[model samples]
Each structure stands twice: as C-alpha cells, then as structure tokens.
Target: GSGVLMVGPNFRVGKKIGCGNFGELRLGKNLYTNEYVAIKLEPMKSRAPQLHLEYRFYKQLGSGDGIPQVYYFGPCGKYNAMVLELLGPSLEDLFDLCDRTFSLKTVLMIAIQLISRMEYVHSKNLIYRDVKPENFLIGRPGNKTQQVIHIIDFGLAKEYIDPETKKHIPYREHKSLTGTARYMSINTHLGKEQSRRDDLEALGHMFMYFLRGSLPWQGLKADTLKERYQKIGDTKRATPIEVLCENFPEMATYLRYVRRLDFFEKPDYDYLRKLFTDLFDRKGYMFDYEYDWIGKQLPTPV
Candidate 1:
C-alpha cells in the first residue's frame, strides 16, 4: 500500500518538477536537516530496472565534482524513488535565456569543465551516450552551487566495457539511435555502437552549437521523420569541418581531432585542455571567475 506525504518519515514530497519515461521528479524537503532535494519516483510496474540502473550509477559515482549527491533510495509500495540534491537550470535553458549564443570565453570555460568531467566518466569504463547541452546544468541561482556545472540524466549512459571480463565490447553497427539527433555523432547517425570517441565527438558538436548558435543540419526539412533524420545525418557527414567551423578556426582543429579518433580510443585530455588554455593565454585573458550571465560572482575554486 502506498502512503501519503513522505517517501519515508524524513522527506516530504512537494510539487512536481519534471517527468520522463522512467519516472516523475518532485521537489522534496528533508524534515531532519531542512535541506531541499529532488525526489524521483518511478512505478515499479513500468520501469523498475531502468531506475535501479540509474541509482546504481549515481551510487557508484559517489561524491565526484559535477555529479549530484544521492541521499536516499528504496522501494515504496509500487514505486522506486530516490532523493537527491536539487540542481539548477540546464545549459540549454541558459542558452535560450541568453539569446542562443555564448561568448568565446564563456564557451571555452564550459568546454574545459565538460572535458574534465567526460574524462572522469571515461575512467569508470562507461560511455555517456548522450552528450548535449540539455544534460549539463549549472547549479541553482544564488548559492555555492551556482558556479558549479553538474552533469545530469544518466538514463542513456551505458557501460562500454564488460564488468566481469573487464574488456571493451567489440564494435558493431546498425544499432538504434539513443540520444538527441541534433547532437549525435556521425557514427551515431550511422547506427554504429557508441563509445568514448563518440562522446568526445558529440562534445565537439556541442561546443560548435554553443559558438555558432546552430549546427548546419539543425533544421533540415523532409516529408517524413525518417527522411528528415536521414537528411540531417547526410548533412552531418557531408559538411566538412572547414565549412562547419568556418568562423571558428580553433573549433575546426578540435572537431578534426575528435573526428579522427577510432572507437574506444582514449582522448588526449591534456592536449585538448591546452587548446582552450592556449587561446586564453594568447588573449591574455584570465579564466576570471565570471561566466556570461552570472558574471564574476565570487572567486573560482582552485
């Protein structure tokens, strides 16, 4: 029997905040500590395993920077719910709020942080299949979290390496698309199995989207969804990096570097970081504790 008011005795569920295939997310307030949290509840009858998988991923992730803190999780009647720290609006929302374009300095700042986080996720032998602006969020406004960028939504994440064998999965093709089409890698569009390189490629596409305000294939028109996606995929493959990044030369280099990586190849994270750092050095600009909208709020963490 489902009880009312609380997921447990300590946390009280509030208004609904969000929803997805696996569950409904609601605002929660912890009675004991007076801390606000996000509570995700999934009906066991509908998608128990997916919610369970996400919980395991969150638990394994622990207290890493840019990762959310999971407070409690268990089954409640026919639902599985988790309590987590509340986070801020996604980068997509911020981009929309700021007129769909980010300054070069701001984009570089976001890129470096994202790359560092991606590096950490790779270390876990898992591939973050969905690498788009919507999944990355800044902390809520007017708190210590505001300066921090947290990666959320691990629903599409998959382990690329076998756990017991500790071996990389063999590459395959013609898998169904698993993420946002706009930010999917070319390999992803071709239905190739994704891995670390695909994530980096998608990151490159994301940076380009941030700087250019749109990808070349963003609004391709076709009669059917299939046709539209095919055209979009075709445009992605056909467009040269030179043309794609015509105005952003550094991104041209970045895209080329990512596109050249074979599946399962490790990225040169330091070298990529250097690309953005070198730009900052040349401009003599400090990575000053400022972002585009929330400019210079406080001293950046070392």
Candidate 2:
C-alpha cells in the first residue's frame, strides 16, 4: 500500500528536477494520492529506448526495499515517458558534510545493504551496469536516517542469457564500457569482458570516493582509448591506496580489505552487517575513516 499504484494518472510536470544523457526529469504531484513523484520526459534526439526498458524492469522487479518502484510509462512525446519514485537527495549532495571523509561503519552498512539488493538482482539474471552516487537516492531523509539508501535509475541495466545452455547468465561479457567513463574499471576501459567483479570495482571506487571526496585520479584524461586504458593500467598503487597502505584505519577494515579481494571473490556480507550496525550508533565516533583505509582498524564488538 506504500507504493505508487493508485497514485498514477494525475502526475504532471511541476518543476524540472534534473537532466541526463537521454532525457530531462521533472517533479510531479499525484492529485489523487497527493504524493509527489518524479517524471522522466523523453527527448527527441535519441528517444532513448533504455528508459522504457528500465520502466519494464522496475515494474517486473517491484520494490526490493533498496530499490524504487516504477509506477507508469507511456507515450508522452516523440519518446515515451517513464514515471518513477520521487527521491530526496543523492550521496553526492551530502559530500561537503563529510569533511572529505566518511566513517567505515557507515560505508560498510551502505555497501552491505546495496550489495544485498545487487545479489537479488543478479539472482534474477540482471546486471546493474551503472552504479554510482547519482543513481543512489535517499527517500524521506528528514524523517529517515542516513542508513536508508535506495538505488534508482536502472536505464543502463541489462540481462543476458548463456549462449549454449539457454539459461540466464549471471555475468555479462561485454566489450565496450556501459557506464560513466569515470567510474569504469580498467577492464571496462579496455573494452574487455565485464562481470560482477566489475560492478564491485566500481563500488570499491565509490567507497574510496566517499572517503577521499573524489577519485585519486581526476581530470587526467588521455588522448585515446588505448592511452586511457594504458594510463589506468600503468598507475601504481600509492600510499593513498587502501590496498597498500596501513595508515588510516577503520572498523571492519573494509577500505583496505575490500580492495585486497581478487577479481572473483565477493564481499563478506556478515562482516559488512556488523560494521554498519556499529557505524550508525547515535553515540559513536564522528565520521572519520582515516584508520580504516590503512587496515589498522578492526570491527569492534557491538
């Protein structure tokens, strides 16, 4: 009953919310339910068919606690409009408050909850290619605590089946990158096969970004794709890298621990659960993950 079914028809464009590669998003109000919603209006240039694809995917998947629910999608212009859940703000919006740092507990909590949702989607034979801050939204932040994070905008998501068995393939073997170039992994940059680990790499980068405020390698674009790939490959791990250094430590040691994982190994969910449960404690230490980055921090008893 806490969804957008009965609140469908009256949603009208009220004010512009945001814009992306394919279309513009606007805020709409459902006159019937009086609940606000976000409407994504399609653009004529590309008419981006992915929006419709995402609408269908969300409709099929429905609410997964960490995901938003799709209400409607139909022809509203040369392109079809997709109605979606109205989200509050993104993690990027609150970057300044973090003082260029984040607590390990908070990071671990978010990582687990989202990865749980990701595991569910993967089980359904789906890959959320584009996992970034902009796609993560917070609903009812004023009342809801920061622990509540939701994944939104599944436009670039894809589903593939195994060629021989005709069974749903949990992993994808795509050449070209399918997400924001900045968040792409080295393999993705090379246009190599992408798998679940690729998503984990992007997620790892985000975890670091949440701590460092931005990518360690920013604005260092190369002239060609090959050069870009080479640049990413050649970059040596610095002390700043959580993988090598033992400087700043955090509870659960997630920052360094997550980076040390091989391409195939998955994140430890139980460890993550304990980490987040500690971080969100109202009286816990302030948001500082310096110790966590260097492997000196350990998960404390809750």
Candidate 3:
C-alpha cells in the first residue's frame, strides 16, 4: 500500500474505537462535514495485497439499502485506510437480546434477507469467503423503520467466473479454499471448486446454529480444531440441516428436498407462519418463552 502517495481531504481521525483480526479500525468523525465513518487501517508491516483487492470490490459494489457505503480510500500512515459505513450490533447480539429464542418464522425472515443480499453479490461474480458474526452488522438498532442488517469485511473476498464459462474462456482450473473454518463447506473442505453453492451451505449452517442457540457441536467429543473440521462432513458428528429440521420439520423438509438445488425458488412464506403456529399450539404453549414468541410476529418497533 505504501507504493503510492496520495493526499487526504484534511479529515482528522477520531477515537480508537475497534480492531479486527487484520488491522486497527478507528471511528472517525468529520466535524466540518458532520459525518461518521469507520476507518479500516491496514497493517503496513503486512503486504498481503488483500486490502487492495477488498477496496476494489467495495468500490464496484457501490451503495445499496442493506450494504455499506464506501466513502473514501487513502493512505493513513504506513498502511492503507478505507472510510466506510459504521457498523452496529450484529445478528448474534439480536439473538442474545431477545427475551427468548427466535421463532422459526423470524429465523426464516432473517435468513431470507441475508440470502437475498448474498444472491445479489454472487450475481456480480464475487465470493465473500468470510461469513461470521463479526462480519455482519445491524444498523439503527431498536428502530425497525430505519434498521438494516448488512454484511461487511470483504478482505477475504475474491472475484471468479462460473465453471460453465470456462469452456469459452478456457484456463486451467485452480482449486482454492478460503473462508472461516467453522462456516467452510464440504467442497471447500475437500479443496474442490468454490462457488456460490459453497456460500449457501455456510448460510445453512448459520441457521442451524441459531436454532441450536450454540455452536453446532458445543458439547461434542471433538478435542481439536482439526478433529472438528474432519468431523464436520461426518453426518454423525453435527449436521446443521438435520438439527434445524428436528425442530422446524416442515421447513427442513422443503429445504432438503426442494431448496437444496433451487434455493432461489420463491417459497410461500405463509407456510412458514403456519408451521410456527403449529409449534406454538403444541408444546410451545407450556413454556413462557415459547408461548409468547411462537405465534407472534415481532412488530417493527417504533
């Protein structure tokens, strides 16, 4: 990043707000402009070039309803800095904050929104390898009218074309697996081709974790990271889909038999409501948390 020289618009950096696995992220406010931005300062000592790649992709992504707006990109010190939309609490925070576990319908709603954004990004021919709690942000907390949930931290993202296009643009295939270990898929684990499907598999895992209210195999016998990775593909260890289905049997049925190949196929959301109603009418009636949440649609808080 030090290879080039550039001048800033005289904006001053503010408090040392946060830091990520990669670099120090500071909250900067332009008093003159009355603007708030999150500055991601890359480590000058590390020259991996992923920072530049991320900046390029964000630039192309532009601004959207649920996506962050990239405002500036320049050199802060020995490292490169990108001024972007300030992130808020994550979905995990939402899960923890609710009075009880989320209703099945609520979970599906969140999944639909996030997956819609993912589909859009994939359509643009990019891969967001990182999909973790820390990488997603929910803005305008407690205010539903202004609230938006978004994905961030594209540092590990990459650009690639689908294999079908390879026939016309023939090039030797290079297998690469790049993403969080927990969210990684079987194909990614096999070091095979990585595509949009790989990301969908990860999303399925997220839903499973939400329903389980913990990591998929929290109390399991796996003693090491390597062991867990090896066991992920082993259906006996922890299959997120099956666990989700055990609780949300109807949704699970649709996900497995139909949506597995045609996830984008529009589903009758009313079916989601009915299934949760059935859950509520059954055992859910006995527990306070379940009883209260089972059949209610969380109002868009005012």
Q: Kindly report which residue stretches of model 2 are placed more than 4 angstroms away from their true locations once superposed.
A: 1-8, 19-23, 44-48, 97-99, 141-147, 160-174, 236-302
- lDDT of each residue in 113-180, candidate 1, tens digit only: 88898888888777888888878878766668776888987878888889999889889998976478
Candidate 3 error regions (>4 Å):
1-7, 19-23, 141-146, 162-178, 218-227, 235-240, 250-302
lDDT per residue for candidate 2 within 63-113, as digits (tens), equals 677677677777654546777767766655544445556655556556666
The TM-score that candidate 2 achieves is: 0.73
**How accurate locally, in lDDT, is each candidate?**
0.81, 0.59, 0.58
Clashes of 1: 0
lDDT of 3 by residue, 1-302 (tens): 53432225744665556434443667676556776667777766765766666878897666666778887788776877777766665665566566526555556555656666676676566767677656766664333422455888787765655456632122333454346666565556665555555566566566666765655544544687556555654542346556655856755653453234422232343443454456545643432223113233432211
Model 1 residue 167 lDDT score: 83
Candidate achieving the largest TM-score: 1
